[PDB]
Write an enzyme that holds these catalytic residues in place. Structure first.
Site, short mmCIF file in Angstrom:
data_model
loop_
_atom_site.label_atom_id
_atom_site.label_comp_id
_atom_site.label_asym_id
_atom_site.label_seq_id
_atom_site.Cartn_x
_atom_site.Cartn_y
_atom_site.Cartn_z
N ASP A 145 0.84 -1.20 0.00
CA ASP A 145 0.00 0.00 0.00
C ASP A 145 0.88 1.25 0.00
OD1 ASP A 145 -1.91 1.91 0.29
OD2 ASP A 145 -2.42 1.42 2.35
N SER A 191 -0.63 15.55 -12.03
CA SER A 191 -0.87 15.20 -13.41
C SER A 191 -1.11 16.46 -14.23
CB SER A 191 -2.08 14.27 -13.49
OG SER A 191 -2.48 14.01 -14.82
#
Length: 330
Positions: free
Chosen positions: A35, A199
């Site tokens: 994770d 992004s």
């Protein structure tokens, strides 16, 4: 040193991936959920409340000659999905794919929430976010990667998650045969303890690319892609009959639909998520309403590039003094 381990989807939807981890001496192999959005290595154990164990493999520290109670240390964690777990702490030897750390904090669960009990395939979590998020008290502990870093050939790990198939976690090296083209690296902020990046935009299907900054985290422990409501609405508007369902808890779409791809930007590069990766199947057995793999982050507080996005790429988690992320197509 290096390590390399195969990671395997837990079910036919790729809801999560499990990776075998050797703990203790002799080794006890547990299948952990790696994770990159958390920083605790915790396991089902011989200390877990018996009614909360349902098919998981447990760690028994009393059977490990290298286990040592970390005196006074406790831990307690709550995840973004509302699940939680807590317990005490041992140090022990932990190996992943041939890479060994001695003295790793292994957080033994005394209590786990129902969603963990109900998932027999996941024996615990191995956190790969920054150690500042580790919950052990009163002495915070380091992640497996933090403990291994100095010994690794290069201070990196890579995630290469499969679509409906196994993939690979590598530590200490970048497998140049595992991706196409080049890796585009992008800046990371560690201020919230995550692999947080920005992004450069998105496209829906064959549509034009929208240049827009989308801050979010690279999170292998989250199944879906969670993005701003504007972006998510633009995606689902291209699927006839798709709608947000408050009762189901997100966007659903007719199972008869063919889903468009979704592209996200990494610098000037582009990662394409095929439409099929966005199908999470019937909302309940036999239903013709299917659950979408792109959902709004509006109720989270952060955008999350979970497995839906990451499995479309070869992803480098560069843990150099100034961390960065790398993405390549594959």
């Amino acid at each position: 040193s290096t390590g390399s381990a195969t990671t395997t989807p837990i079910d036919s939807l790729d809801d999560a991936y499990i990776t075998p981890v050797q703990i203790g001496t002799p080794a006890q192999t547990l299948n952990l959920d790696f994770d990159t959005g958390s920083s605790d290595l915790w396991v089902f154990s011989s200390e877990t409340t018996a009614s909360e164990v349902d098919g998981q493999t447990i760690y028994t520290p009393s059977k490990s000659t290298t286990a040592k109670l970390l005196s006074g240390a406790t831990w307690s964690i709550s995840y973004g999905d509302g699940s939680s777990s807590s317990g005490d702490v041992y140090t022990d030897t932990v190996s992943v794919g041939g890479l060994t750390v001695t003295g790793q904090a292994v957080e033994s669960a005394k209590k786990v929430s129902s969603s963990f009990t109900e998932d027999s395939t996941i024996d615990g979590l191995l956190g790969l976010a920054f150690s500042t998020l580790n919950t052990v008290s009163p002495t915070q502990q380091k992640t497996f990667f933090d403990n291994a870093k100095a010994s690794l050939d290069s201070p990196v790990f890579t995630a290469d998650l499969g679509y409906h198939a196994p993939g690979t976690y590598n530590f200490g090296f970048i497998d140049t045969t595992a991706y196409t083209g080049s890796i585009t690296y992008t800046a990371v902020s560690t201020k919230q303890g995550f692999w947080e990046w920005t992004s450069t935009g998105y496209a829906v299907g064959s549509g034009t690319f929208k240049s827009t900054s989308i801050d979010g985290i690279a999170d292998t422990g989250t199944t879906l892609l969670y993005l701003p409501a504007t972006v998510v609405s633009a995606y689902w508007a291209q699927v006839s009959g798709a709608k947000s369902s408050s009762s189901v808890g997100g966007y659903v779409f007719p199972c008869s639909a063919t889903l468009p791809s979704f592209t996200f930007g990494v610098g000037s590069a582009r990662i394409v998520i095929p439409g099929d990766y966005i199908d999470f199947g019937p909302i309940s057995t036999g239903s013709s309403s299917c659950f979408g793999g792109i959902q709004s982050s509006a109720g989270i507080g952060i955008n999350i590039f979970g497995d839906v996005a990451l499995k479309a790429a070869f992803v480098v988690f560069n843990g150099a003094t100034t961390p960065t992320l790398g993405f390549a197509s594959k």
